[PDB]
Design a protein around this ligand. Sequence first.
Ligand SMILES: *CC(=O)N(c1ccc(C(C)(C)C)cc1)[C@@H](C(=O)NC(C)(C)C)c1cccnc1
Ligand SMILES: *CC(=O)N(c1ccc(C(C)(C)C)cc1)[C@@H](C(=O)NC(C)(C)C)c1cccnc1
Lengths: 305, 305
Amino acid sequence: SGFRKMAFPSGKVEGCMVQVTCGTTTLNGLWLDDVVYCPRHVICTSEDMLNPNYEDLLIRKSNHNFLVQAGNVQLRVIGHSMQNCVLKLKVDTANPKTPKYKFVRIQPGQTFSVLACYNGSPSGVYQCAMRPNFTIKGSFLNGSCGSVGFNIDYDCVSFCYMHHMELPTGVHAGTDLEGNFYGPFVDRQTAQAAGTDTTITVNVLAWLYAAVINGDRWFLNRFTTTLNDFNLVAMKYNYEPLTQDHVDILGPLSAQTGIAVLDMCASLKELLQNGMNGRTILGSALLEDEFTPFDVVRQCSGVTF
Amino acid sequence: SGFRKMAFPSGKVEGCMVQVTCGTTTLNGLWLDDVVYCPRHVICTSEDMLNPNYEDLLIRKSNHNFLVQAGNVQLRVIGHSMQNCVLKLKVDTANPKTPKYKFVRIQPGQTFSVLACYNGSPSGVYQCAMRPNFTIKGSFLNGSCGSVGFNIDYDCVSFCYMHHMELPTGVHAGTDLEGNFYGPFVDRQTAQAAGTDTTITVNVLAWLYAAVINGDRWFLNRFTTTLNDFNLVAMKYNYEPLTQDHVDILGPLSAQTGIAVLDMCASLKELLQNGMNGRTILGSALLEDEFTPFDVVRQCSGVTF
Ligand SMILES: *CC(=O)N(c1ccc(C(C)(C)C)cc1)[C@@H](C(=O)NC(C)(C)C)c1cccnc1
Ligand SMILES: *CC(=O)N(c1ccc(C(C)(C)C)cc1)[C@@H](C(=O)NC(C)(C)C)c1cccnc1
């Protein structure tokens, strides 16, 4: 029993973290096979910070301007290329610790683990969700860019996030491993505000199922509702709309707890309309929305990797 | 910026997790050098649970009854011994991945990272505190016994916890790596009282400093207090008494933020007496006590390993 915010074991990603230094700027890169991936703003100077011409800065750089360090092993860069907002440094050595991996682009609401890193070295691991407004509420200091987010399915690491920047509000913005920003953000020091984030409804419901599984059941009521009536309530409380897909996704938890999804929707509706009355659910006084249905199952079922 | 419950990178521990099988029951072991550490109750069976005679049960076993698997590779057990509540299987082979390590017995209120494992395979990593009553509020299912908790200091893994059991109460009990239980618990299937818990005051204050460092400052008050006055309040709200030692441990945070320790206590006193009025501190509606002052500094300074 018990329910905690659990990250994937980070070993397979730790062996891929390197340090990338171009001129005065050092950040983290991802070493897979003979390629190092890192944010393109490594080639920026403090001058270009407000609006850099990335094509200009790049074409002028050559292979030896990039210092890549895997632990104490210096890698020799034998090629470089820019793909969207990431740099791909070709190195002379394939990473002997390269795991089975894929690059994926996650949807809002999906969770992943972040291995926060500085100067190529791992600092700690925690779980994040891609917020509906395409930011993440992470823990990133200066030099953390290039840290990555990932999921692990048995032996295969699915890289989904590379960290690039903090917004003025303290939230975090980044790309997939093809360099495409999540959300409308760009890699310059400009005026870019996240936008109103909403609550991931299907996740709150999964966590409510998790609560029931662990014996917290006070919030359960004698009411049901409809998807339409519930969506009216979710919209008033800045909750993502619930779809038939979300309902289908919640089947497994519904069949384990014997609690119909619409019945749990009626519970969540009462919790949104009346608040929590100073009670706690799974040790929290807020409705928690950073567990997917897969997370709840995996944590209540023991899936390993 | 930002602040999350952050675990140490788990890689060094991942290469140490093996599967130990003795007859019917299989659990997780810790393979360091040529020794595999696991809960001695792996030698129990169905009828032995309520009050096993471990000395007697161990006698009925010899080396070949203990199946150790490190991945698909089989380890040959060549010696076996009981140390308090842990079995020590001496094996044919030193773990080539053995990190630099120590065994330590931590103090209540200290934190560590847990690498939750099933069948010798890691499934996730999370941070938690040794409660004042020597339990931990973890996430552990059947077969998770043998999973370990640890801290890392640069390159040395300090193993401090091995998981043994869930109390019917839902919290978790285990031992140091010499097999001595934290708290009054015994490794038998019997009802066992954990005893009154307390909130870890110094950690709450450390987390309030973390909050200030991250821009949540609404709770900072126009008031002060005294150690004895604060402790009268702390004891009413089931908080650990604050000592000068705790004050001194808070010195660096107080120095960084410019807020005297006894002033932050005045802030904490009023949160305790009045609640949060539906405000959140670092995304929480409860006062968090699972961050040590060192945890905060490490996270807000980007310490690396
Ligand atoms: C990479 C990094 O850590 N940055 C960062 C530097 C430079 C940029 C641009 C503007 C694209 C050149 C973006 C990010 C840190 C930083 O220096 N500044 C801001 C606040 C992100 C603009 C940083 C600090 C904290 C968290 N993430 C990133
Ligand atoms: C090892 C394990 O996962 N146990 C467990 C088995 C056997 C024992 C004793 C009674 C000491 C032989 C202790 C723990 C799980 C379990 O089956 N039962 C209890 C309730 C913990 C006693 C278990 C399940 C969940 C979390 N931890 C352990």
